[PDB]
Structure formats: structure tokens, C-alpha cells
Amino acid sequence: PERRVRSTLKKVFGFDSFKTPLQESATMAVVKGNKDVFVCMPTGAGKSLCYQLPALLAKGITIVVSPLIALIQDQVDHLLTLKVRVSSLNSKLSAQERKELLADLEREKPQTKILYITPEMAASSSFQPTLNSLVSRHLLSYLVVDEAHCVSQWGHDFRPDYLRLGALRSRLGHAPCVALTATATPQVQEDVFAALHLKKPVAIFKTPCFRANLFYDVQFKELISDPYGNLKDFCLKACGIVYCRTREACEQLAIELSCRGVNAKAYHAGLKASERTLVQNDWMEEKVPVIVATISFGDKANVRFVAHWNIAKSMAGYYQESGRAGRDGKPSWCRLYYSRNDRDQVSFLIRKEVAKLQEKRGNKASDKATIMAFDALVTFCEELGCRHAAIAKYFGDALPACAKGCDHCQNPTAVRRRLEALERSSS
Ligand SMILES: [Zn+2]
């Protein structure tokens, strides 16, 4: 029972023991296949190893639901190097490759062990009959729902195709379901259980937001004399990402940093399908050490810094973006740059998209959630107190008694006066 898990852990990867006992607590509940489980912890090996382990353990194949296509390839190629039979069904996947795999799942004792899928492909009318041949033949081991908060209409990243998966679990009661996420919002948590129709009750496994290696400091653009210098000075003490709003803002900073010595390259949807995949592969190979990107770039362990030039659309989103730093456990720095003009620029767009929705559909409780998400982040910088403690109130996590890992922990007087300095700078 417990013996099989440890023997299959060190064999494939090379791990003496689990990172946290909560990882074993989650894994054992999945291995059991008795209940439906909810996993909520930061990205990396930890959370993935909770579905990757019982899949090989139990006899059958897994259906992993992840929306990111580029993320799917990053996790299938790393899995293949660990010697596992893994497949990935996406929209870009050709019909010749499709029939090779479509006939594989319908055949006796299929060759592939792990199957990656996007919500658009799984819920589709075309693939719909293929899973029924595994539904009846008992080959459907588990149902994996990565990035679970996209079915919320209260969450920072609502993806509509996530709603189709809702009744899918209630339709297929034969296999247990695992809901994986990082966004620990109580309204979103409750929504995940209801919208996905998860088997009541759900064994919830949650990990704290705080990370010792991360330093969260808030800088203010409205009071900095040389902002481009202040940015490269932070950048020099270090791979790493510099997030911002527009495709032209990152294009500006990619060359504005490069000239100062610290080489940086831009990333967004504006770059070609071949260019996007190239600069992403040129990032891992440290020829692109510093990467300037938008919301589009969402894995590497060595992420020394996550600086936000422009204020993020949501408080939940900022946590997801900044929390990509120091996956290895090594020290990293997460800086947020504030300006009431940049603030207003987003607030105006947020109010413009919401008003366009009301002009077509009408008023909704979900329409208010988007606005309230940004307001939760505008307070994060404009308010006095510890940065890690502000994360704790938003998601509901425990109060982390921090020291030398936050701006308030380093100087609760210098940043304090900087707030009073911001108000007088208006007129
Ligand atoms: Zn602090």
C-alpha cells in the first residue's frame, strides 16, 4: 500500500521522501480512489506528483485537463525523459497524429499511460465517443483538473470552456476526480466544488502562501527620479521575468535594459508562432536571461526575480505571476511598481470591458468580481502593513510572522513616509 508509493517515487525521479507530509496525505487519498480530492499549493513538482504518481500505480490511464498548450509540451517532454508513456491531445495536433492515438485508447490494454487534454478538446463532440470506450472498459482511472479556478466567475482567470467539464464528473461517477489549483479564494474554492460537481464530501489539502526565499517590496514610479536605472539595479543582483501591461511596454523595456548592459528580450502574442516558441526556448538556454513579458507567459526552477513594471489586473493574478520566482528554494525578489496614472489606466479599461458586457448581456454578480479583484491589489500598495499578511487576508491563509522577507519587515518607516509622499505629489 504505502510501500509501492515510495518504491515508485525514487525509481522514476530520484526522491528520498516527499517535500511535505500534505503531499503524501494528498497522494494516499488519490491512490485510494475512494473520495474526490482538492489540491491547492504553488506550482512545480509537488502538486503534479499528486496525480502523476497514482496514475502509474492504479491500472488504467489518466485524463489531465490543463488549458495551457505550451505548458502541456513542457510537462510531456520532461515526463518522457523520466521514461513514461505520455500523450498530449491539443488543437494544433495533426489528424495523422490524432488517428494514431484515437485508435490507441479504443484498443485493448493501451500503450500510453498519461493523456494530457484541453477543455476545448475533451468536451468536443468529435472526441466525446472515444472516452466512452474507456468509461465502460474501466480503463478511466482518474479525472485531473489542473488550473481549477478557471470555472469560477469570481476568479482572476475565468475560462468559459471550464464549465463544460462540470457535469462530466457527475456523468462519470466510476472514476474519482482531483481538482488542482494555486488560487486559494474561498468563493472560488466553493465554486470549484459546485461548478465541477465534485463528489461530496471533498478531502481538501491546502498549503500556505508564504515562502521564505521570496522578498516582497513595493516601489513607487511617481517618486523615482531614474526609474530605468532603479529597475536594472534590482535586475543586476541575480533567469528572471519583468512583467508589464502592453506589448509595447515590454518591447520598450527589452531594449531599455539591454542598452544598460543587462540583456533582456520581449515576449507576447504579437511575436510569430515560430518566434514565441523560439524566444521561450532561448530563455531556458540563458541567451535570454531576463525576459520581459505580459500575462501570456505562464516552468523553470531558477527564477531569481519577478518585477511588475505595470500594476496587475487582479490581486489573485499578481500572486500567481510573482509566485513563479525561486521554485528551487533559492533566494528571489518580487517588486511591484505603483503610479496612480498606471492604476487609473487599468481601472478605466476594466470599467470599459465590464460596461461592454452589460450593454450585451446585462448586470451580473460576476461582473462586480473583476472590479473588486483590482481594488484588492490597489489597496495592497496604497495600504500600510506587511505584504505577506495582505496575501493571507485575500485567500484566507494563516498570518505569517515574517522578518527580512518583506519591505515592512526591512523598513516599516521609510515605506510608511513614501505613502504620505504619494498624496502630496497629486498637486
Ligand atoms: Zn512582511
Residue numbers in the entry: 12 to 249, 261 to 320, 324 to 452
Reproduce the article's own wording on this structure.
The Zn2+-binding domain consists of a pair of long antiparallel α-helices (also known as the helical hairpin), followed by series of short helices and loops, from which a cluster of cysteine residues bind in a typical Cys4 tetrahedral arrangement to a single Zn2+ ion.
Crystals of the Apo form of RECQL5 were obtained using a construct spanning residues 11–526, this includes both D1 and D2 RecA like domains, the Zn2+ binding subdomain, and a short section (residues 438–453) of the previously uncharacterized RECQL5 C-terminal region. Crystals were obtained for the APO protein which diffracted to a maximum resolution of 3.2 Å, and the structure was solved by molecular replacement using the structure of BLM helicase as a search model, with two chains in the asymmetric unit. The final 74 residues at the C-terminus are absent from the model, and appear to be completely disordered from the electron density maps, indicating this region is disordered, consistent with the results of various disorder prediction servers. The most prominent difference is in the relative orientations of the D1 and D2 domains, with the inter-domain cleft almost completely closed in the APO form and considerably more open in the ADP bound form, with maximal displacements of equivalent residues of up to 30 Å. Similarly, the ‘closed’ APO structures cluster at the bottom of the plot with RECQL5 being similar to the APO form of E. coli RecQ, and chain B of APO D. radiodurans RecQ (chain A is in a rather more open state). Comparisons with other RecQ family structures show the ‘closed’ APO form to be more typical of the conformation found in other structures, while solution studies show that the ‘open’ ADP form predominates in solution. The APO form is believed to bind to DNA primarily via D2, with motif VI forming polar contacts to the AR loop stabilizing the low affinity state. Finally following ADP release the relatively long range charge interactions between the acidic residues on motif II and the basic residues on motif IV (which are no longer shielded by the nucleotide or magnesium ions), would bring the two domains close together to form the closed conformation again.
